[PDB]
């Protein structure tokens, strides 16, 4: 009946979309940037080494002051560091030790974490009396928490291993909207600078652009061959980058709705775990399974440097809002600050 | 600069107070062994928990050694992402219903899952403790003409019980042959790529209560002993 006809309609729609994108593909980003002088050699060194975590580190998040940062580990601790003088401001023991993500509120009053418990927890760092305690638990996901980011002191967006993303109201602990359309597990999230949209990558090799208010999917991006592990907006909010298990990084444009450039090398055959941009968006930084981190020229696709100081898999990565330091976590339980 | 000195001193005092508690917790962390309990919906994974929402957790201690067993619940059947969280457990307990030899081909699915676990690049140092349930159900199925094993495995016909095997008294040769055939099925995956960095410890559990914890204890002891021997260039 109607079956085997909707498939045909989807086929013609996909062919039309591909034809439109091919027609809109005037040139390549390489040709226009082929006259740009190369960046050169980026040589960076470790300035700090933060010690005190027992098990491997999955996540970290910088603060907006570019001095404090939070990290999470499988030992069941959430440690808040002072990147200057390497002092531990706080250390939160978690009810569940299988944490996979953490977030730091832009105001500085809260942190969040979650993992294989299908719960997002919010911790009050500015309690009037006593110590840091848990304030709100967000329940409603049917799979593990993969990522979480604050919009403000009362709104947080989460992704889960149940193929959905959600938006929550912290005061009442209910889902404002639910974002659906992915077929694989959602692994990474990134908020736009305007805080009006966010992108996500899932275990289906596709990335989606979402609208927080309407709760709808606006664009879908393909081009990767395996699971997408990390995602990050360009500084101006018109582009983003992804890293997948096919040992490749790609740059996608929101307006052009197609991939612009590919960052790969023949020697690299391991997956990419984390990705981040520089302050000006000229340098792209990625963490791999070969224990190193590569510094890519985002405009010319050639590698410019390496941060090789970790003895195990690099799990997380981060650049300050100020832009004067990079922190790198690893499965060897060490946080390194590079400059 | 006086206020700066005061705040720096307060920062250092808080740092040392935190380091004291971290040192206290390190001792508790290093004296505990973490297990991953894995299986299927009906293969078992329940009575083992009975012996003692996104993840369950069970605590038990034998001979003043603490064990933490982590039962995965409310997770999708796609395991290739959250399985990486258990690379540093002492052992993985793989639970299989050996009676279901008649999707409905549960044994082949369990074999493929075991092969994927064994050959994963992040679990290459993790040992597996293999439990085979429903031996009574397997014996009842084999005795009757309900089904056959040759339909799904055309090699049980050319298989005979090994001499070194130790069947329990009053057990038919056919059911023992089937049990050891399944055990050798798993052992042929396990022995192909071990290289000494991890091993498999198969056991036949039928209705034993509180013996399974003793078997897990002994297998973990053997696992850690072999790691220590291998790290001292003695094995």
């Amino acid at each position, epitope marked *: 009946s109607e079956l085997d006809q909707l498939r045909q309609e989807a086929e013609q729609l996909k062919n039309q979309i591909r034809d439109a994108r091919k027609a809109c593909a005037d040139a390549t980003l390489s040709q226009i940037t082929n006259n740009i002088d190369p960046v050169g050699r980026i040589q960076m060194r470790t300035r700090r080494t933060l010690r005190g975590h027992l098990a491997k580190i999955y996540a970290m998040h910088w603060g907006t002051d570019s001095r404090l940062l939070v990290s999470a580990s499988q030992d069941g601790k959430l440690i808040i560091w002072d990147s200057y003088t390497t002092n531990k401001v706080h250390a939160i023991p978690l009810r569940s030790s299988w944490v996979m993500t953490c977030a730091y509120a832009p105001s500085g009053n809260y942190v969040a974490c979650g993992g294989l418990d299908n719960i997002c927890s919010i911790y009050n760092l500015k309690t009037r009396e006593g110590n840091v305690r848990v304030s709100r638990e967000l329940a409603g996901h049917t799979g593990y928490l993969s990522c979480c980011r604050f919009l403000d002191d009362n709104q947080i967006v989460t992704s889960s291993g149940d193929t959905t993303c959600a938006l929550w109201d912290i005061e009442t602990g209910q889902q404002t909207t639910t974002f659906t359309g992915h077929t*694989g597990d959602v692994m990474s999230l990134s908020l736009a600078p305007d805080t009006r949209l966010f992108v996500s990558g899932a275990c289906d090799a596709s990335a989606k652009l979402w609208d927080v208010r309407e709760g709808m999917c606006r664009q879908t991006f393909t081009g990767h061959e395996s*699971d997408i592990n990390a995602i990050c907006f360009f500084p101006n909010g018109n582009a983003f980058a992804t890293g997948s298990d096919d040992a490749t990084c790609r740059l996608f444009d929101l307006r052009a709705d197609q991939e612009l450039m590919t960052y790969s090398h023949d020697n690299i055959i391991c997956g990419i775990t984390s990705v981040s941009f520089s302050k000006s968006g000229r340098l792209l930084l990625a963490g791999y399974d070969d224990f190193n981190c590569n510094v890519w020229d985002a405009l010319k696709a050639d590698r410019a440097g390496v941060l090789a100081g970790h003895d195990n898999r690099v799990s997380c990565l981060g650049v300050t809002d100020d832009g004067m330091a990079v922190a790198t976590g690893s499965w060897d339980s060490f946080l390194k600050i590079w400059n | 600069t006086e206020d700066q000195r005061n705040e720096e001193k307060a920062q250092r005092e808080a740092n040392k107070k935190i380091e004291k508690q971290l040192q206290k917790d390190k001792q508790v962390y290093r004296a505990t062994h973490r297990l991953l309990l894995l299986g299927a919906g009906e293969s078992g994974k329940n009575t083992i928990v009975k012996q003692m929402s996104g993840i369950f957790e069970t605590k038990f201690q034998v001979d003043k050694v603490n064990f933490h067993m982590f039962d995965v619940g409310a997770q999708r059947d796609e395991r290739r992402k959250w399985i990486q969280c258990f690379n540093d457990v002492t052992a993985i307990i793989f639970v299989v219903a050996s009676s279901s030899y008649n999707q409905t081909n549960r044994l082949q699915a369990a074999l493929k899952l075991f092969d994927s676990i064994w050959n994963n690049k992040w679990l290459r140092d993790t040992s597996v403790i293999l439990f085979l349930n429903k031996q009574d159900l397997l014996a009842e199925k084999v005795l009757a003409g309900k089904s056959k094993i040759e339909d799904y495995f055309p090699e049980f016909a050319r298989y005979t019980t090994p001499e070194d095997a130790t069947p329990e008294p009053g057990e038919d040769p056919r059911v023992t042959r089937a049990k050891y055939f399944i055990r050798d099925e798993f052992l042929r995956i396990s022995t192909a790529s071990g290289d000494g960095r991890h091993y498999c410890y198969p056991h036949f559990t039928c209705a034993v209560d509180t013996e399974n914890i003793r078997r897990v204890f002994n297998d973990c002891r053997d696992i850690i002993q072999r790691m220590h021997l291998r790290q001292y260039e003695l094995l």
Partner: nanobody
Amino acid sequence: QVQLQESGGGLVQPGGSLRLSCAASGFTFSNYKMNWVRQAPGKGLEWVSDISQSGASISYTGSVKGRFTISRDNAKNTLYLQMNSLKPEDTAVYYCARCPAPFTRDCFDVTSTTYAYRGQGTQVTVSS
């Protein structure tokens, strides 16, 4: 985008033969392991066969070894399944699945209820 489209199949008398085909696009074929999966009516997905990146290593379920044959052509990005002899309990839909990641010896979720790297499937039935 990754596309797996199965061809071949249909209605065949018992004891007959068929040759299923699966054309792949959107990825480097040679770097991945490939499988064959099927779903009988009233049953779940079960694995049938698999082949390595080059073809040296091949496996079958016990019910199809000696009769079915799996081959791959990396030059033309096609996966084959020669179904030499058929039985009435071979009526199902056949899907060509792909390994989640390249350069790996393990295939985790190729038989789950939902999986992003599987094909549409072709109905194969034998009745009389």
